[PDB]
């Protein structure tokens, strides 16, 4: 709606080397924030070299999720 207040989108994070996770995260988080939250939820150590791929493309860690093309129920790949 006009002037809506919704903060969250749900994302599926698939990982070939770690636990897949479905997260509901604020769209004002950065991609780095999303990675940090993934890591605390699945209990792996956060590192600068972890990346998220969306449709074949690396997401910029410094972009807000809202600034990317991610939408609710999208899926991304975690590359460790
Ligand atoms: Ca997995």
Curated annotation (Swiss-Prot):
It is found in: Nucleus. It comes from the Eukaryota. Phosphorylated by cds1. Interacts with rfp1 and smc5. Required for repair of DNA double strand breaks which occur during replication, or induced by UV or gamma radiation, via recombination between sister chromatids. This has a subsequent role in the maintenance of chromosome structure. May work in conjunction with the Smc5-Smc6 complex. This is DNA repair protein rad60. It comes from Schizosaccharomyces pombe (strain 972 / ATCC 24843) (Fission yeast).
């Amino acid at each position: 709606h006009h002037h809506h207040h919704h903060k969250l989108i749900t994302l599926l994070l698939r990982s070939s080397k770690s636990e897949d996770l479905r997260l509901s995260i604020p769209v004002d988080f950065t991609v780095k924030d999303l990675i940090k939250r993934y890591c605390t939820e699945v209990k792996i150590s956060f590192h600068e070299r972890i990346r998220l791929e969306f449709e074949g493309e690396w997401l910029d860690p410094n972009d807000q999720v809202q600034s990317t093309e991610l939408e609710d129920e999208d899926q991304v790949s975690v590359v460790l």
